[PDB]
């Protein structure tokens, strides 16, 4: 069958997808949707084959019968003798970051503060932090906890979108795709760097990747790590160097998903595409690179060393783990076993 149709989310990812489509000699073609959800539907219908998703969306995808095929792996310390493609995935840390100058803000005094979220339904940006607030607060009232937030994908007229800025001209406020200024890992972190919000729910790697001259993007150019603190669950605050002992949760890596009747095909094409455009691809730095997009995480997170085989041929609950599958179950009790679509 040999030709994969990718789903890009919003126009910037479409533009990266068209390029990959060019360089691959149409072995990969593109579809476009304004939202991760519309992309998942395009996959069910049969009009696209695959997309990379965050743990929170893999849960949506999986109730609809979709399946993880390959997982993003990043450069690890331990596990160094194995090749990247076969090496297990380590998971990322979900953290809550605050400005250091904001003395006195802790996990215990987040109520009525201003929040930056990656997007509704994502792991570190939404499910993990809102999950814990609901429990601790004993209330599905998670929409009234923060005075104001930017939480792409929530109702544009509610407080959950008060802090989102839309695109170049103000259109598309709160859409869950990179058109929204403060969408995604990088979005949320900006939303705090610029002091729009008081706290940002991102992952550990995002603090490092956008501070101390690692980015060269205008907003981040002068961000110093020493200016941030991680909020831990014990009430404490610690340097961003201590993420290992001050995190909300370890999240399952983002993974490529596809209908089950297409996974073997979507896998064969991906391992060959990354052998050409992956980190050491034949054609990576010279012609085109899959895992790069100047700090914008389009299609894949910029720090992806390689897409990895899963091994144990896991279902979507086994891939996500029972810890996580229970938190998403319990939090979705607030807003009964079916596919949303």
Ligand X SMILES: OC[C@H]1O[C@@H](O)[C@@H](O)[C@@H](O)[C@@H]1O
Ligand Y SMILES: *[C@@H]1O[C@H](CO)[C@@H](O[C@@H]2O[C@H](CO)[C@@H](O[C@H]3O[C@H](CO)[C@@H](O)[C@H](O)[C@@H]3O)[C@H](O)[C@H]2NC(C)=O)[C@H](O)[C@H]1NC(C)=O
Ligand Z SMILES: *[C@@H]1O[C@H](CO)[C@@H](O[C@@H]2O[C@H](CO)[C@@H](O)[C@H](O)[C@H]2NC(C)=O)[C@H](O)[C@H]1NC(C)=O
Ligand U SMILES: *[C@@H]1O[C@H](CO)[C@@H](O)[C@H](O)[C@H]1NC(C)=O
- Is position 243 an interface residue for ligand Z (rule: CB under 6 A)? yes
- Is 122 annotated to bind ligand? yes
- Is position 305 an interface residue for ligand Z (rule: CB under 6 A)? no
Residue closer to ligand U, measured from CB, 24 or 89: 24
CB 300 within 8 A of CB 72: yes
In this chain, which of 97, 250, 290, 299 binds ligand X, going by CB under 6 A? 250
DSSP characters for 117-181? ES-TT-IIIIIHHHHHHHHHHTSS-GGGSSSEEE-TTS-TTSGGGTT---STTS-STT-SSTTST
CB 118 within 8 A of CB 106: no
Residue 69 touches which of Zn ion, ligand Z, ligand Y, none (CB < 5 to 8 A by kind)? none
249 strand-pairing partners:
94
Residue with structure tokens 């795709």?
177
Residue 231 touches which of ligand Y, ligand U, Zn ion, none (CB < 5 to 8 A by kind)? none
To ligand X, the closest distance from the beta carbon of 92 in angstroms equals: 8
In this chain, which of 26, 81, 169, 244 binds ligand Z, going by CB under 6 A? 244
To ligand X, the closest distance from the beta carbon of 283 in angstroms equals: 31
Residue 123 touches which of ligand Y, Fe ion, ligand X, none (CB < 5 to 8 A by kind)? Fe ion
To Zn ion, the closest distance from the beta carbon of 310 in angstroms equals: 10
Query: Residue 172: which residues within 8 A CB-CB, separation 6 or more?
Result: 166, 179, 180
Residue 326 touches which of ligand X, ligand Y, ligand U, none (CB < 5 to 8 A by kind)? ligand Y
Calpha distance 320→121 (Å, rounded): 14
- Record the tokens describing residue 122, joined without a space: 């994502």
Binding residues vs Fe ion (CB under 5 A): 54, 123
């Amino acid at each position: 069958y040999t030709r994969v149709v990718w789903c890009a989310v919003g126009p910037e990812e479409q533009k990266k997808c068209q390029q990959w489509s060019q360089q691959s000699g149409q072995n990969v073609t593109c579809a476009t949707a304004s939202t991760t959800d519309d992309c998942i539907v395009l996959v069910l219908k049969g009009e696209a084959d695959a997309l990379n998703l965050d743990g929170g969306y893999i849960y949506t995808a999986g109730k609809c019968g979709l399946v993880p095929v390959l997982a993003e792996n990043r450069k690890s310390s331990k596990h160094s003798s194995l090749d990247c493609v076969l090496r297990p995935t380590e998971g990322y840390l979900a953290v809550a970051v605050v400005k250091k100058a904001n003395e006195g803000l802790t996990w215990n005094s987040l109520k009525d503060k201003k929040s930056c979220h990656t997007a509704v339904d994502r792991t570190a940006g939404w499910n993990i932090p809102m999950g814990l607030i609901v429990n601790q607060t004993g209330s599905c009232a998670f929409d009234e906890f923060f005075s104001q937030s930017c939480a792409p994908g929530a109702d544009p007229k509610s407080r959950l979108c008060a802090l989102c800025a839309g695109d170049d001209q103000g259109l598309d406020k709160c859409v869950p795709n990179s058109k929204e200024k403060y969408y995604g890992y990088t979005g949320a972190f900006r939303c705090l760097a610029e002091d729009v919000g008081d706290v940002a729910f991102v992952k550990n790697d995002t603090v490092w990747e956008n501070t101390n001259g690692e980015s060269t993007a205008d907003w981040a150019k002068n961000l110093k790590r020493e200016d941030f603190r991680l909020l831990c669950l014990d009430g404490t605050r610690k340097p961003v160097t201590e993420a290992q002992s001050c995190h909300l949760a370890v999240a399952p890596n983002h993974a490529v998903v596809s209908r089950s009747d297409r996974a073997a095909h979507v896998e064969q094409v991906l391992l060959h595409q990354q052998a050409l455009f992956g980190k050491n691809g034949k054609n990576c730095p010279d012609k085109f690179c899959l895992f790069k997009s100047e700090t914008k995480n389009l299609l894949f997170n910029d720090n992806t060393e390689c897409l990895a085989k899963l091994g144990g041929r896991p279902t979507y609950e086994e891939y996500l783990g029972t810890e996580y599958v229970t938190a998403i179950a319990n939090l979705k009790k607030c807003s009964l076993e079916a596919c949303a679509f």
